[PDB]
């Protein structure tokens, strides 16, 4: 019977909440109070990647920390060279309504997706010289957001149909489907160990997923609005979220509760993209108030404010060597800050 | 030039990419984009037919003007998460069925959607081309059933003209910003060839007014 199932379901949820509360004894603030803060950090616009003619929706850095790809409102997917202003590639899209892009760790592939409910994989290194779409992936019933390459052959995609999917490129088939979110899933991040990935959804909850098993290993709450961003800590045992309620929270995998609430009273605009520094001390967070904010992740303060852009910062990335941070806003510019 | 041969040719490649990219951007800005919204297939299919998984893009030309209709409705997701993708669209084609006052009420849901779209954070500047489809079926329904069932506060009668005018006026009244944006209402039905002309005339007004506001003359 439905009622007798739901009563014990909410009892079990209360049991989980009690287990989390008992397991928490000292907040991250109490023991991070001992160390001195990083102080004010004033990064500057080293490069300004102009060339888009519309609103930029996503970016992803390369594993070489020099190449990055950006997707804009116009049907264009540009691959940059961060050490210069050069455009390595600029490839058109079948659907201009692109909401995400990912750059494969090997650099051989770049993905994109959006309102077409399709993740398109582009082969960058071909003998033809141009860039050809390779096995555009269909099967999601909602707008696809924040696809990420697990490797050269497996890509995990999130869509606005409350599901996440794992694909095989040769036979695009949405092999593992991650179901259990109530609202649209906005962003996902991959753990460095390449075994687990967490996804944030519009149901004001984030779930940790087992890629091989396909089960929802862990679930996290605390946000009271749509979670628009998520990013793993560099060690893989923690992650940070950014939601429309203008607050960033630092969860962790070993426990099941939050550690920080990176929020400011003067900030009332939601977060669009969140990124971490190489050491994990700096929590970059792209905000809706036309500029990005730098947070000391161990502390709960604001080390610096990335200089304001012409529009809301929609995308954000930190190089694998941490040498630079790149933002892209709803204007047509990407900025590298170092 | 303190640059090698490879990097100089990379700069040349980037400049070529910039030129063709700007050409594509200019050709995309030259054409006009339209956004389609019905209230539960209340006329979207028939308005696409009259004017010739994911979202559907319809391309058509009328009097040397390339139109792009982005028909959403198959998304079946939260509109708040992708409705900002269409900010900057030239106009919004909103379709409602006149023969739905008797059929909560479908017309009231249409009004709710219209209020949500017009009074949006993104669609402030963009004008809205409202469509009132299936006027013949509404003729028949009015001749068969009174309109007072849909509108408890109605001062009209069985006449078509006053009922249609009242529905239109209720639709304009849903706008809270009658100066930043204006609604181009129209009455049409099936097998009506004047509807594409209405869209063209209305969008020409939208384009001229937008250019004049960019000049500070409006």
């Amino acid at each position, epitope marked *: 019977e439905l009622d007798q199932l739901r009563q014990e379901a909410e009892q079990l949820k209360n049991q989980i909440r009690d287990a989390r509360k008992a397991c928490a004894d000292a907040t991250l603030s109490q023991i991070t109070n001992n160390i001195d803060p990083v102080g004010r950090i004033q990064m500057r616009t080293r490069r300004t990647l102009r060339g888009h003619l519309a609103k930029i929706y996503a970016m992803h850095w390369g594993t070489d920390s020099r*190449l990055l790809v950006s997707a804009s409102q116009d049907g264009k997917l540009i691959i940059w060279d961060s050490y210069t202003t050069n455009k390595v590639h600029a490839i058109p899209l079948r659907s201009s309504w692109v909401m995400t892009c990912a750059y494969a760790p090997s650099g051989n592939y770049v993905a994109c997706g959006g309102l077409d409910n399709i993740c398109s994989i582009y082969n960058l290194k071909t003998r033809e010289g141009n860039v050809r779409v390779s096995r555009e992936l269909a099967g999601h019933t909602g707008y696809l957001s924040c696809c990420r390459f697990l490797d050269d052959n497996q890509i995990v995609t999130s869509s606005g149909d409350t599901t996440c999917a794992l694909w095989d490129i040769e036979t695009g088939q949405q092999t593992t489907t991650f179901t259990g979110h109530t609202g649209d899933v906005m962003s996902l991040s991959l753990a460095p160990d390449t075994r687990l990935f967490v996804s944030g959804a519009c149901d004001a909850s984030a779930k940790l997923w087992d890629v091989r098993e396909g089960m929802c290993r862990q679930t996290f709450t605390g946000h009271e609005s749509d979670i628009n961003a998520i990013c793993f800590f560099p060690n893989g045992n923690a992650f940070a979220t950014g939601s429309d309620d203008a607050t960033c929270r630092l969860f962790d995998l070993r426990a099941d509760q939050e550690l920080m609430t990176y929020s400011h009273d003067n900030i009332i605009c939601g977060i669009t993209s969140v990124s971490f520094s190489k050491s994990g001390r700096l929590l970059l967070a792209g905000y809706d108030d036309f500029n990005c904010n730098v947070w000391d992740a161990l502390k709960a303060d604001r080390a610096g404010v990335l200089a304001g852009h012409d529009n809301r910062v929609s995308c954000l990335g930190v190089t694998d060597d941490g040498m630079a941070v790149a933002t892209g806003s709803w204007d047509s510019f990407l900025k590298i800050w170092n | 030039c303190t640059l090698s041969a490879e990097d100089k040719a990379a700069v040349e490649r980037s400049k070529m990419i910039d030129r063709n990219l700007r050409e594509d951007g200019e050709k995309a800005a030259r054409e006009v984009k339209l956004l389609l919204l019905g209230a539960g297939e209340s006329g979207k299919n028939t308005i696409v037919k009259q004017m010739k998984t994911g979202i559907v893009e319809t391309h058509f030309t009328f009097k040397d003007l390339h139109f792009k209709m982005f028909d959403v409705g198959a998304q079946r997701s939260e509109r708040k998460k992708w409705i900002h993708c269409f900010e900057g669209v030239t106009a919004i084609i909103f379709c409602v069925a006149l023969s739905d006052y008797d059929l909560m009420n479908r017309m009231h849901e249409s009004m709710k959607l219209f209020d949500s779209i017009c009074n949006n954070k993104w669609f402030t500047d963009t004008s809205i081309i409202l469509f009132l489809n299936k006027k013949d079926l509404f003729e028949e329904k009015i001749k068969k059933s009174p309109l007072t069932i849909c509108y408890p506060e109605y001062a009209g009668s069985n006449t078509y003209e006053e009922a249609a005018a009242y529905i239109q006026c209720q639709f304009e009244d849903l706008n809270k910003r009658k100066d930043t944006k204006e609604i181009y209402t129209h009455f049409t039905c099936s097998t009506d060839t004047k509807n594409v002309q209405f869209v063209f005339d209305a969008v020409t007004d939208v384009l001229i007014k937008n250019n004049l506001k960019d000049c500070g003359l409006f």
Partner: single-chain antibody
Amino acid sequence: VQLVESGGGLVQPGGSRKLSCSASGFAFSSFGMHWVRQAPEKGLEWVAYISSGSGTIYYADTVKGRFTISRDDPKNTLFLQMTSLRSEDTAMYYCVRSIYYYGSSPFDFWGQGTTLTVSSSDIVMTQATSSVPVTPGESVSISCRSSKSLLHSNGNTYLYWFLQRPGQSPQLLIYRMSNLASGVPDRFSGSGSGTAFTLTISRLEAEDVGVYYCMQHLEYPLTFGAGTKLEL
């Protein structure tokens, strides 16, 4: 991917020839095009260069003012108008594909070439010798030396390695010093210090025999070296 070429043949001295290079199987409009020639017995020698979408029309010192080079992107064909042919221009010209984005591999594909016979400062690089004996299944080191340092401030050593099978066109192996090509066996490897460069082959096979070429790409006049032929 094809770069078939047409033209050539015996030409009286002072004559004119109209070489053609019909590209096929790739985006010819986005590829820089080179011309490379070799004497019927000597090593490779760079000729000219046309960038993507025309633009840069770099020539060589021995051909400046002549050998005007043009491209036709819509027809995917490359041309080389030849003026005032001399007895020193007898060579088999190669239509070399090239692309120059970051991480690209210039000089990947070479055409089969057309033979041309005519009846009767810049970086200089030389190799160890004109022939190197080596038994199959053994590792040998092939060395080429340069006058000016090929390492640039950006950190890229624009040293190139090409292998020419007997009767076949050159095939790129190491497009930048210590950076292996695509489609070549992993046994080939490159190394260098900035002026002296050595190539390791790591237990070569039967098909690895041929002529090796070392090309710089720093100062745009591209100079090859006296090829190191490998005894079979």
